[PDB]
Design an enzyme around this catalytic site. Structure first.
Site, PDB file in Angstrom:
ATOM      1  N   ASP A 127       0.891  -1.465  -0.214  1.00  0.00           N
ATOM      2  CA  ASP A 127      -0.042   0.177   0.220  1.00  0.00           C
ATOM      3  C   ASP A 127       0.857   0.889   0.007  1.00  0.00           C
ATOM      4  O   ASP A 127       2.247   0.766   0.541  1.00  0.00           O
ATOM      5  CB  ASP A 127      -1.151  -0.270   1.155  1.00  0.00           C
ATOM      6  CG  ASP A 127      -2.188  -1.225   1.521  1.00  0.00           C
ATOM      7  OD1 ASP A 127      -2.176  -1.337   0.613  1.00  0.00           O
ATOM      8  OD2 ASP A 127      -1.579  -1.662   2.372  1.00  0.00           O
ATOM      9  N   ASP A 142      -1.536  -2.964  -4.325  1.00  0.00           N
ATOM     10  CA  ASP A 142      -2.633  -3.178  -3.693  1.00  0.00           C
ATOM     11  C   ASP A 142      -3.100  -1.944  -3.586  1.00  0.00           C
ATOM     12  O   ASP A 142      -4.055  -1.024  -3.736  1.00  0.00           O
ATOM     13  CB  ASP A 142      -1.783  -4.189  -2.452  1.00  0.00           C
ATOM     14  CG  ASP A 142      -3.117  -4.895  -1.250  1.00  0.00           C
ATOM     15  OD1 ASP A 142      -4.024  -5.398  -2.388  1.00  0.00           O
ATOM     16  OD2 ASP A 142      -3.136  -4.816  -0.459  1.00  0.00           O
ATOM     17  N   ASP A 158      -4.707   1.518   3.671  1.00  0.00           N
ATOM     18  CA  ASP A 158      -5.612   0.580   4.097  1.00  0.00           C
ATOM     19  C   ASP A 158      -5.540   0.726   5.921  1.00  0.00           C
ATOM     20  O   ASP A 158      -4.603   1.204   6.386  1.00  0.00           O
ATOM     21  CB  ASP A 158      -4.883  -0.527   3.452  1.00  0.00           C
ATOM     22  CG  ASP A 158      -4.912  -0.655   2.275  1.00  0.00           C
ATOM     23  OD1 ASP A 158      -6.620  -0.444   1.412  1.00  0.00           O
ATOM     24  OD2 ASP A 158      -4.876  -2.521   1.264  1.00  0.00           O
ATOM     25  N   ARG A 214     -13.302  -0.035  -3.847  1.00  0.00           N
ATOM     26  CA  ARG A 214     -13.184  -0.183  -2.444  1.00  0.00           C
ATOM     27  C   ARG A 214     -12.578   0.948  -1.877  1.00  0.00           C
ATOM     28  O   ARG A 214     -11.921   1.124  -1.309  1.00  0.00           O
ATOM     29  CB  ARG A 214     -11.633  -1.541  -2.450  1.00  0.00           C
ATOM     30  CG  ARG A 214     -12.574  -2.646  -2.234  1.00  0.00           C
ATOM     31  CD  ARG A 214     -10.884  -3.496  -2.263  1.00  0.00           C
ATOM     32  NE  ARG A 214     -11.675  -4.416  -3.615  1.00  0.00           N
ATOM     33  CZ  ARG A 214     -10.381  -5.814  -2.494  1.00  0.00           C
ATOM     34  NH1 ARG A 214      -9.243  -6.035  -2.376  1.00  0.00           N
ATOM     35  NH2 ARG A 214     -11.529  -7.060  -4.042  1.00  0.00           N
TER      36      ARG A 214
HETATM   37 CA   LIG Z   1      -3.226  -3.487   1.571  1.00  0.00          CA
HETATM   38 CL   LIG Z   2     -10.872  -7.106   0.713  1.00  0.00          CL
END
Ligand SMILES: [Ca+2]
Ligand SMILES: [Cl-]
Length: 399
Positions: free
Chosen positions: A184, A223, A227, A279
């Site tokens: 990330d 990714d 997060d 997301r």
């Molecule tokens: Ca991640």
């Molecule tokens: Cl996920």
């Protein structure tokens, strides 16, 4: 106070809960740093447990894929001697390997390769730290800041292209499997009291369109952007600009991690999500206040087509207010995606393509999330979200 000494306002989201987010504002001058490369950054951060209040100014572009002489590193520098992409692909091809988890020589060589890269790109941010970009062009390229600690401010930085040379094949992930990468731009791994503000997040000069497909699935080098996992808590992300990226913001990494219940208290406000596939956020368990965010994209883009904004994952408690989605043609229901265990969503003032919708009701959800946010700054009417966010979100809109 100057940028390096500014703190999160006492009412500004879950980050302001309890002891709040002061970062390194109390630093003495011997813990005030200006850094312009990986070595300087690492030295200024010190060890995981260096809790001395510190302020770190980033000047220019810090490329994290570099050795201790700041020489650039790529695949062949990081690769384990046994790893070979060609051989990994022939090993794990679903038409000969089937759908069992990869194992044996090339998966092992792959895991060790990934560890080698990780040791360079991933850096831990210790407690009581403010990292802020100087001027309008502060950048972190290739890096994954990991925050496992309390009381951290990250502002006014453009994060680009947190790139993994060794994506893992996972044939058990959905019906035709997926490739997954580790990095990330920021990972809040059990961290608490965090403010991420006026940052920009993108995929730099390596957008996903320059990745091939292997086994019919995108060979994904990226990714998340920001997060949160493993009991991360008390976080405000405000005025950031996420763009031209697939998986933006995942809060709660697993349905099995029920210790995330009562945590992942995160506030997202005044963020911009442009050409984000999905997301934004995807939530398990958390009480997540999502307000005054602007989402813009196309379902027919060839690089990063919009799929959904909010992922209603297991026992998620999203409380959404006055957010604006501009994705032409998109059905109201498809503003969100519901996953197993996702049963509830409160949303008011949601605008989709100028029209006030009720996303929760369009998906047959309950609108009872069992909490109501008390700790927030003033909430803008939905009609002003697009301008405020376009004009104010992102790196270099302060200096
Ligand atoms: Ca991640
Ligand atoms: Cl996920």
């Amino acid at each position: 106070a100057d940028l390096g000494h500014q703190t999160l306002g006492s009412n500004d989201g879950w980050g302001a809960y309890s002891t709040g987010t002061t970062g390194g504002s109390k630093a003495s001058s011997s813990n005030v740093y200006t850094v312009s490369n990986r070595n300087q950054l690492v030295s200024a951060l010190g060890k995981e447990t260096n809790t001395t209040p510190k302020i770190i100014y980033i000047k220019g572009t810090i490329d994290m894929n570099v050795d201790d002489n700041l020489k650039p590193l790529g695949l062949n520098d990081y690769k384990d001697p046994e790893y070979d992409l060609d051989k990994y692909l022939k090993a794990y091809d679903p038409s000969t390997w089937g759908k069992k988890e990869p194992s044996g020589t090339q998966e092992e060589a792959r895991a060790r390769s990934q560890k080698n890269q990780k040791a360079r790109v991933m850096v831990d941010i210790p407690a009581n730290t403010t990292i802020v970009g100087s001027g309008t062009n502060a950048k972190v390229v290739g890096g994954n800041f990991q925050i496992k600690s309390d009381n951290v401010i990250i502002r006014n930085i453009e994060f680009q292209d947190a790139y993994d040379y060794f994506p893992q094949w996972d044939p058990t992930d959905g019906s035709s499997g997926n490739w997954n990468s580790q990095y990330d731009n920021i990972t809040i791994n059990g961290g608490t009291h965090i403010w991420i503000d006026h940052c920009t997040f993108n995929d730099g000069s390596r957008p996903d369109s320059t990745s091939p497909k292997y086994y019919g699935r995108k060979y994904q080098h990226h990714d998340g952007q920001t997060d949160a996992s493993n009991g991360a808590n008390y976080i405000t992300m405000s005025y950031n600009y996420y763009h031209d990226h697939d998986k933006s913001s995942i809060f709660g990494s697993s349905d099995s991690k029920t210790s995330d219940d009562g945590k992942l208290k995160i506030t997202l406000h005044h963020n911009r999500y442009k050409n984000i596939v999905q997301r934004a956020p995807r939530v398990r368990f958390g009480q997540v206040h999502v307000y005054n965010n602007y989402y813009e994209g196309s379902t027919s883009s060839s690089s990063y087509p919009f799929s959904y904004a909010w992922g209603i994952g297991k026992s998620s408690k999203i409380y959404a207010q006055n957010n604006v989605i501009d994705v032409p043609g998109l059905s109201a229901a498809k503003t969100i995606s519901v996953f197993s265990g996702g049963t509830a969503l409160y949303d008011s003032g949601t605008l989709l393509n100028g029209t006030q919708i009720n996303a929760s009701a369009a998906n047959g959800l309950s609108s009872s999330v069992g909490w109501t946010p008390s700790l927030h700054g003033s909430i803008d009417a939905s009609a002003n979200v697009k301008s405020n966010v376009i004009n104010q979100a992102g790196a270099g809109k302060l200096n």
